[PDB]
Amino acid sequence: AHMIFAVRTMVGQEKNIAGLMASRAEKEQLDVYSILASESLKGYVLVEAETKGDVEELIKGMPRVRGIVPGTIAIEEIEPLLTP
Amino acid sequence: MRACLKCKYLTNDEICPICHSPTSENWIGLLIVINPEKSEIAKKAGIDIKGKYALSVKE
Ligand SMILES: [Zn+2]
């Protein structure tokens, strides 16, 4: 696989936004594969998707989202988040 | 919301629908797997069925 993006959110809304994202991804049939909200990463949600465009459509008009961090995130930078 | 003590699957159920183990309210972190087959993160997390999972859980 490949692309993962960090989406900036309001601090404390991470899990809430991950939930809204998953619902929208399924409803809109976006190529979004997983969404990760780590307690050690406040103010951001990580979105694994086929293209950046998928993430743009995912967050389009979503409240409490500020935007997408530039550049992809490598899988190795994410792994330590998997076992808190 | 509770999380399976073994596989971290998130549910209101006191018993995990996947592996039948007890669930706990004491969980941390959120990983939502929409497509296990295509998710590299799910694979690293040892997840092969769609759902929402905690990152860590304790009794
Ligand atoms: Zn389980």
Swiss-Prot record, chain A:
One of its GO terms (cellular component) is ribosome. GO terms for molecular function: structural constituent of ribosome; translation elongation factor activity. Changing L46A: Can still bind RNAP, but with a decreased affinity. Does not affect elongation activity. Disulfide bonds: none annotated. GO terms for biological process: regulation of DNA-templated transcription elongation; regulation of transcription by RNA polymerase II; transcription elongation-coupled chromatin remodeling. Keywords: Transcription, Transcription regulation. Belongs to the archaeal Spt5 family. Composed of only a NusG N-terminal (NGN) domain and a KOW domain, similar to bacterial NusG. The NGN domain is the effector domain of the complex that mediates the interaction with RNAP and is essential for elongation activity. Stimulates transcription elongation. Heterodimer composed of Spt4 and Spt5. Interacts with RNA polymerase (RNAP). Forms a homodimer in solution. This is Transcription elongation factor Spt5. It comes from Methanocaldococcus jannaschii (strain ATCC 43067 / DSM 2661 / JAL-1 / JCM 10045 / NBRC 100440) (Methanococcus jannaschii). The gene is spt5.
From Swiss-Prot, chain B:
Zn(2+) binds at C4, C7, C16, C19. Pfam families: Spt4 (PF06093). Keywords: Metal-binding, Transcription, Transcription regulation, Zinc. SMART domains: Spt4. InterPro entries: RPABC4/Spt4, Spt4/RpoE2_Znf, Spt4_arch, Spt4_dom_sf. GO terms for biological process: regulation of DNA-templated transcription. GO terms for molecular function: zinc ion binding. It comes from the Archaea. HAMAP family: Spt4_arch. Heterodimer composed of Spt4 and Spt5. Stimulates transcription elongation. Belongs to the archaeal Spt4 family. This is Transcription elongation factor Spt4. The lineage of its organism: Archaea, Methanobacteriati, Methanobacteriota, Methanomada group, Methanococci.
